[PDB]
Amino acid sequence: PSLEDLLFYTIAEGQEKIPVHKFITALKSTGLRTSDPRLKECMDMLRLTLQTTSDGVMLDKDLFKKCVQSNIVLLTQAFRRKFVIPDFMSFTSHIDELYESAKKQSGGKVADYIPQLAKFSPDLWGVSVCTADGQRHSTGDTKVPFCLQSCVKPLKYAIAVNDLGTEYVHRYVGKEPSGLRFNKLFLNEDDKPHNPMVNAGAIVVTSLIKQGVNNAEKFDYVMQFLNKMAGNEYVGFSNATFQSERESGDRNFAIGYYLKEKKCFPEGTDMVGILDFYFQLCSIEVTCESASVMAATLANGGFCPITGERVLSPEAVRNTLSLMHSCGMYDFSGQFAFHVGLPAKSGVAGGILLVVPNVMGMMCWSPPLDKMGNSVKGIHFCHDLVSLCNFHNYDNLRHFAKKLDPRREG
Amino acid sequence: PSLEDLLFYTIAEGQEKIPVHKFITALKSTGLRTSDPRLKECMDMLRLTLQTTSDGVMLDKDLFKKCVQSNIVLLTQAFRRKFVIPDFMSFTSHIDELYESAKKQSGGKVADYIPQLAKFSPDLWGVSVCTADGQRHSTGDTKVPFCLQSCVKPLKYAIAVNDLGTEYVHRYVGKEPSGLRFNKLFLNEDDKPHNPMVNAGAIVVTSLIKQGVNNAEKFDYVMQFLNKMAGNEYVGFSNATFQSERESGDRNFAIGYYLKEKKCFPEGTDMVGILDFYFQLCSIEVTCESASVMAATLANGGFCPITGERVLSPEAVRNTLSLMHSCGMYDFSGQFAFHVGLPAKSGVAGGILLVVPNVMGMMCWSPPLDKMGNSVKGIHFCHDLVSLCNFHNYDNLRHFAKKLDPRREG
Amino acid sequence: PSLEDLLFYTIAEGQEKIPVHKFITALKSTGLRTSDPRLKECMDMLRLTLQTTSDGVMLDKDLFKKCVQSNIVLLTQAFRRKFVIPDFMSFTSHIDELYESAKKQSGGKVADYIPQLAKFSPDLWGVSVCTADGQRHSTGDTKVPFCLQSCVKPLKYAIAVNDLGTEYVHRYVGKEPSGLRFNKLFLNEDDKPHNPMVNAGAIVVTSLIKQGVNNAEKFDYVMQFLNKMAGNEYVGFSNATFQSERESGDRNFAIGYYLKEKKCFPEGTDMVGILDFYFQLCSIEVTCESASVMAATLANGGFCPITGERVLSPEAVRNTLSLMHSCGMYDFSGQFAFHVGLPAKSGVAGGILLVVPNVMGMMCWSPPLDKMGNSVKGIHFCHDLVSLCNFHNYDNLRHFAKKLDPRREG
Amino acid sequence: PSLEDLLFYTIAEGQEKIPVHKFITALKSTGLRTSDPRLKECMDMLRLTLQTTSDGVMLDKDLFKKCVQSNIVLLTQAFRRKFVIPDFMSFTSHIDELYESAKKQSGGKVADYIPQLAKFSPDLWGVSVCTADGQRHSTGDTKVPFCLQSCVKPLKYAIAVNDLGTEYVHRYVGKEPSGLRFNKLFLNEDDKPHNPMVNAGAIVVTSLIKQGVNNAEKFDYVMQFLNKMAGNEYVGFSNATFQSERESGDRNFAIGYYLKEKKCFPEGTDMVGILDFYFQLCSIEVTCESASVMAATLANGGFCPITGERVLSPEAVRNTLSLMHSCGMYDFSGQFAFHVGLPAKSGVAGGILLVVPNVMGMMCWSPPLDKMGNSVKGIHFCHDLVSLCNFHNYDNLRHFAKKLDPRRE
Numbered sequence A, B, C: 001p002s003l004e005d006l007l008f009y010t011i012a013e014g015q016e017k018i019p020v021h022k023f024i025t026a027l028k029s030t031g032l033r034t035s036d037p038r039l040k041e042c043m044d045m046l047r048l049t050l051q052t053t054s055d056g057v058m059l060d061k062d063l064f065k066k067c068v069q070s071n072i073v074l075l076t077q078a079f080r081r082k083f084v085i086p087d088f089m090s091f092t093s094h095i096d097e098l099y100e101s102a103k104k105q106s107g108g109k110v111a112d113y114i115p116q117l118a119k120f121s122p123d124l125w126g127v128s129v130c131t132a133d134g135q136r137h138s139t140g141d142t143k144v145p146f147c148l149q150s151c152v153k154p155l156k157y158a159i160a161v162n163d164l165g166t167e168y169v170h171r172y173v174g175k176e177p178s179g180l181r182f183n184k185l186f187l188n189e190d191d192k193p194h195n196p197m198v199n200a201g202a203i204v205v206t207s208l209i210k211q212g213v214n215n216a217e218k219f220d221y222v223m224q225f226l227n228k229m230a231g232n233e234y235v236g237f238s239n240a241t242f243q244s245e246r247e248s249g250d251r252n253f254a255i256g257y258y259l260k261e262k263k264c265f266p267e268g269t270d271m272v273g274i275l276d277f278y279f280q281l282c283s284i285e286v287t288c289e290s291a292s293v294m295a296a297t298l299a300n301g302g303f304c305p306i307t308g309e310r311v312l313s314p315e316a317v318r319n320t321l322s323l324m325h326s327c328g329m330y331d332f333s334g335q336f337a338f339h340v341g342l343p344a345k346s347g348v349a350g351g352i353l354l355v356v357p358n359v360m361g362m363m364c365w366s367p368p369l370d371k372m373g374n375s376v377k378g379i380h381f382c383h384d385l386v387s388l389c390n391f392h393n394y395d396n397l398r399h400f401a402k403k404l405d406p407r408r409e410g
Numbered sequence D: 001p002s003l004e005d006l007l008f009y010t011i012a013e014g015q016e017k018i019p020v021h022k023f024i025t026a027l028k029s030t031g032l033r034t035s036d037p038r039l040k041e042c043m044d045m046l047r048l049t050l051q052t053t054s055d056g057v058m059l060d061k062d063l064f065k066k067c068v069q070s071n072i073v074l075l076t077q078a079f080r081r082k083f084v085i086p087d088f089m090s091f092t093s094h095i096d097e098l099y100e101s102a103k104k105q106s107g108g109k110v111a112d113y114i115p116q117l118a119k120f121s122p123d124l125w126g127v128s129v130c131t132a133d134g135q136r137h138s139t140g141d142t143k144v145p146f147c148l149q150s151c152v153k154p155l156k157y158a159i160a161v162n163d164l165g166t167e168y169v170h171r172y173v174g175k176e177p178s179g180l181r182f183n184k185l186f187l188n189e190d191d192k193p194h195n196p197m198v199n200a201g202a203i204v205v206t207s208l209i210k211q212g213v214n215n216a217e218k219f220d221y222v223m224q225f226l227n228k229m230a231g232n233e234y235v236g237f238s239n240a241t242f243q244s245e246r247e248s249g250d251r252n253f254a255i256g257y258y259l260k261e262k263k264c265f266p267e268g269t270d271m272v273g274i275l276d277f278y279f280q281l282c283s284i285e286v287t288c289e290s291a292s293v294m295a296a297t298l299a300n301g302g303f304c305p306i307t308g309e310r311v312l313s314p315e316a317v318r319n320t321l322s323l324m325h326s327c328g329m330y331d332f333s334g335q336f337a338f339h340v341g342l343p344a345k346s347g348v349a350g351g352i353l354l355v356v357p358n359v360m361g362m363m364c365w366s367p368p369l370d371k372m373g374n375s376v377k378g379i380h381f382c383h384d385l386v387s388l389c390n391f392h393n394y395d396n397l398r399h400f401a402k403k404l405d406p407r408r409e
């Protein structure tokens, strides 16, 4: 027997030669993108073959073997329906149905405190999925850039804990939700910020990363880190958003001097420079598609699912998911964890970074926020997703009533 | 083919007839107890047969089938290592190690609030495990009865949500932790108690169960419900503990009058009668073993693992586990959620009810409490357990660093 | 020389004999009532002579001498304009003017929680004045009984401090206002009630008076005090108000149990008996006239102005006025202290006990309350009164701009 | 009759002529100082005559009249013992006794967060009195300059209310104590600072004064105002303290940005410039003597007692005294109002501005603070003062037990 050959028979279906487009179509229906970085060798060999043998686009067993051999393990997992969601085409038709239903929730107000979020349409709406195996689906406006805003807070906390360790980080920042109306206090009773998901805690965490290097390199270093998280998909930067947040962030300067006074930063911190860095991190741009891969790295124990790259330690990913669970959705965190039961993080640009641990990462984006700061269409979507599927942190994988389990077959 | 007979060969082990103790010994090592309620028919058949032939008590092929036929599906899974923890004997060896290391943490103070919890010794320490498949293990004082105290709160919340539904129950009680800076208030700003896991919230939940029938019938009904939850293992009642709670609950009467004044009860509530019921519910008695089965029902979507009976709705089991996650360990809940990442609920007699969703339920019991009200030995055990195994709610099942995964074979 | 003689000449106006009605009229215009207890002997002899000498009604010097001889010292201050408010007839004309302007403020809502406070009319409005010299004036419904409610709180604190001393009393009760965003906590950070003017503070103070005797004698003992303070004018009791206060005090029972749990009462306290005592003290009845004398006793360093009797120690009167100043008007205390600057205490029956130190005491009563619990017409009157006269705690006696100073002549 | 003559005889005591030193001694014992601004003409006339007749410096009726005639009403009130405290020398003898007992209270910590308060001694201690009539007494270190710090807060509040009115001022700042469980929030529920006596409230009040003018002119105007309040006694400015407060007011910059975000300032406010102004106001220097005169203006309805000038509206002085009562001694405010019952304001340099309305103004100064920020010797002194004299706001002037009433004979 031979593994390149058994797959050949699986697809050849008693026929002699495989039309190459027939191979591509079977590949895509698994959820894999033909541009998947782990498939470069296979696609490079196929494109070359349609040059070298420009008569009739047929693969025999000998030719099939040489094209798929380098990436054979992944292709068998895809074709032997071993991915986390085996019937991916079924699942995405549900995602599309939830997407369309959320689309009808036309309420909410686009954040307009700087002229740059004001220029976004209320009608922009996109959802992107990347599973722990790299299966991809997008619907709506998933290639429109927008800033991460507070959706960067879990990412940079994950980075700090990865590089510095649990102990160090949490000498400077707490690990609990504050209390449904301690939203106005910057510090807990230990004179630490409550958690990394509130502005004061993120500001403290911004001040822990890559100490002793200047702001240009600190930024470069985080960007390089986010690029790996996103499997090298779009990660960008809005200088415009940066200028407007720095010229209008009185509240963040208030946090900054308060934290300095109460000595909350590591020694030798230049607070106002740290505030500058913080404004930059919030103006990093993503798309729905690229950001979904970042959340999938967090769903996948810190390995980027579309590259196989270890990005973050398991410790960083667990802490981040733990604090996204209780602290990630502003004053709605407690209601969200109860009804949705998934780690998620919202930002004022209307994004929600969603993690279904061991299954998939998602980014939903609709700019209109509700009175709590959370995107109306996104929130509506994340209730539906958990109401349809047994993805709630405390659903049971064996007894789950009328809910759907996309990880399973029949 | 025949499943009773291919099973016979796996155990007969090329030989002709099976000595019955060889079958019993093999059975026990899967984790199953000979007393498993789902095995009665088979055990009844052995009881008949080992009566008939006290010489040549060995089971031939025909006779083995005759005893095992009725429970063959369950015996096949046990013997083909299909249970959630396949190598259960190794697992209990780690449980026994965690037990001994917790056993040496001699700190803490026995609650000295009543003469009935005061009469318990600091040296009592017990841990009991029941998986979602009914596999059982105990070490220490796992058959010593003790009162549930606040470990009854998730159970009575479970029943209430089971009988009335999420929406109704939460007209009366919130669903978030208050904040370690609002542990002293009885009501949130919506004038409901913060969650069901605190005294004010539990008192409100007591008032929703079986309204309009008297308290004698309500107690019977809760006991019958707890009986299904523990698969009819030990559930009792301490009148002594009840009397001492009834003369020592000034704080509970303060709560009761405050809730009545603010109209927090359903109409037709007799507040002073509800407090009496509440004091009884806190004096329901369990062992580590029976209570471990109660937790396993919560690990298993509301189906009792040693009987197969559907006891609680999934909605009931999900809400309860969500609120044990953030509110179950007094002021230590936020730290416990971060570091342990399991639903747990502690009580003042030294019990900690632990749920590992889709894996197991446990009860740890040591009366000596720490300064926050939590069992010292219990708390220490629950750290080691998650430090050893990837049972943390947000550990990754694929990349998990140095931890052990008992669900795996190799 | 002789005082009976020059006083005789003062009234005689060069004439030989004084018509007795002329003496009565001059006396009344000073503010004194002919029924003033300090004038009994003089009035007894005048009435006696209008019997013995139905030939008259003229008084020559010797007969005037024998009637006034007993009360001559006070009659001289009355007639030589030595009282705190010399031109008393002018002053009452201004009181009447303020009464009428307050009379037109028809807003507010009568207290409606028990059947006995609901039954008081919005049209009742009365103001009664008693200076520190016994000068009296009334306007409106000043002889209608009503319950003191929280206006008894300063009185019983005064008794407490009088009998036990500042240090002892304030081991159990604080001396500060809670903070306008702390109306809902029963205890300050030292686990004492904030001050004696809140319900929990009054409940603690009720428990300090005449410890170890039963409730019947404790009550009599306090009533006996209120009689002396009111110069033996009407002090009564509403059993009806008492019964409904005890059937509607869920919150007060909530306070009592909370206070017992936190060990806030003196040892040997029967908390539930103390609550009944407190409900009794709140149903003590006065009129505006008798209660104005109680306030005048507080304006007078603890001496009753219409009897000359020492009732309360100065230390007791000072502490009380300090806490009526900052804590006396529910959530309006800080605004009232800023804009009115007078010691005052409001109650839910529509009373406001007002003290102008060294000048007079007052009682205003109009049942309609405002959203903070304070009598609407009462509040309006005390603003106008201090806008008219330099009575504000921190007005100046030399420079006072547009204001009138009734202590002055021309 | 003649007013200069009846006074001349009371002082002459039936004798020929009054020796000039004998008239001066009688003056000093009333409490008045020979430098009292309201006595300048009489003193100017005395210095003129002390040249003409440089030998036997006796004043006869005719010559005495020539010196006192211009200031006769005030000299008559002083010599007929019509002042608020008639036996002032008795009263000051008690002040000295309270001073010495407080001096033995050696505890507390000199504030050291800026090097300019660090450089002060723990043993500095002075008390100064100026009555509503200009009677003066000092004991201790009453001519040593020190910064006002938060004891300026009521003064600049008084100015704002004087110039802009109660309504306007309190559109921006509350009028209540927060509650000993709110000293850490900058804003009350209406998103105003709780009162003008806390830092966030004073920072806002700084922003109301003399708007639209630059900081140089704003400071000048407050100084000119303070000069009137203190009857032109010592008022200065410490540049050093200013530099250290501006380089270390991270908490104050935190307050400023928070207030800016919640839009608590009047339109067109330059916040960072307002903070600079605020640091300046807190580095104004006084002595116990000059500052005691400022407090006497507040005890006297806004009239400066040693000049007769109307300085503050009555509305300004009452509001100020009301909030000094409840908000003036940091977390000790509620305790101070209960046991002392006088408007007072303390600052971190160890000063306490004390007002007994209608009686006197006072300044106590000892740098060592207690754990709440209040001067230890000052706090001890004002407890003793009210334990001895019926000065508590809610003492009775008629029935006051064993206490002293310096207003009576």
Ligand SMILES: CC(=O)Nc1nnc(N[C@@H]2CCN(c3nnc(NC(C)=O)s3)C2)s1
Binding pocket: B184, B185, B186, B187, B188, B189, B190, B191, B258, C184, C185, C186, C187, C188, C189, C191, C258
């Ligand atoms: C919206 C809201 O706040 N609702 C409430 N729920 N419960 C409340 N107070 C109960 C009753 C009185 N208790 C307390 N008094 N004092 C305290 N604090 C301290 C330092 O002693 S706690 C406990 S208010």
Ligand SMILES: CC(=O)Nc1nnc(N[C@@H]2CCN(c3nnc(NC(C)=O)s3)C2)s1
Binding pocket: A184, A185, A186, A187, A188, A189, A191, A258, D184, D185, D186, D187, D188, D189, D258
């Ligand atoms: C109505 C209202 O809420 N008004 C407010 N005013 N000011 C606020 N917050 C400022 C800025 C953040 N500060 C604080 N953080 N943490 C604290 N307490 C502790 C124990 O750490 S105080 C102070 S909220």
